[PDB]
Design a protein around this ligand. Structure first.
Ligand code: NI
Length: 179
């Protein structure tokens, strides 16, 4: 099972590489990895299991974070729970949004304050565990989580988006989500 020890941290070059497209039909190994990734997210959000396994609560995970450079992401948002293979953002809203509390990441062992501005609405296409295609419209927190994970497969970390000069600057028109 996936543990914190399996999650690589900032400094490991794999986090900055562009993940490889995975085969379709989905291989049994990529299917198994996805299952284990979703299990990890669920375990991290169960108060008892999180304590037993000493896990940080997490709503999204990307294969690169396990040192597996593949375009596979898992999300479990407290409304959306699935594994996406070869996910792509087909379109997005003009309107942007950011989490009021900023963002974190299990691969980052320091607090990096500041707003991470992302698109409030996105249309994403992906293949599920069976290799069947899906086209979904996401918004708000779900959209934020998916963009955070897709960034991982493109070698991007959340703090790359923070305006170091003015970490809490809020443009015109940007929404704020307060969890
Ligand atoms: Ni992350």
């Amino acid at each position: 099972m996936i543990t914190m020890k399996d999650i690589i941290r900032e400094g490991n070059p794999t986090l900055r590489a562009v993940a490889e497209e995975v085969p379709v039909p989905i291989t049994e190994e990529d299917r198994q990895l996805g299952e284990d990734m979703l299990t990890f997210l669920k375990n991290s959000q169960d108060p008892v299991k999180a304590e037993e396994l000493q896990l940080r609560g997490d709503v999204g995970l990307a294969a690169p974070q396990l040192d597996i450079s593949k375009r596979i992401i898992a999300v479990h948002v407290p409304s959306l729970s699935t594994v996406m293979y070869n996910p792509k953002i087909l379109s997005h809203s003009v309107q942007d949004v950011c989490l009021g509390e900023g963002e974190g990441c299990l691969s980052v062992d320091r607090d990096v304050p500041g707003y991470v501005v992302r698109h409030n609405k996105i249309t994403v296409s992906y293949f599920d565990m069976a290799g069947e295609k899906h086209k979904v419209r996401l918004k708000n927190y779900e959209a934020i989580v998916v963009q955070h994970e897709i960034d991982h497969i493109n070698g991007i970390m959340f703090y790359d988006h923070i305006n170091k000069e003015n970490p809490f600057a809020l443009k015109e028109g940007v929404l704020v989500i307060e969890l």
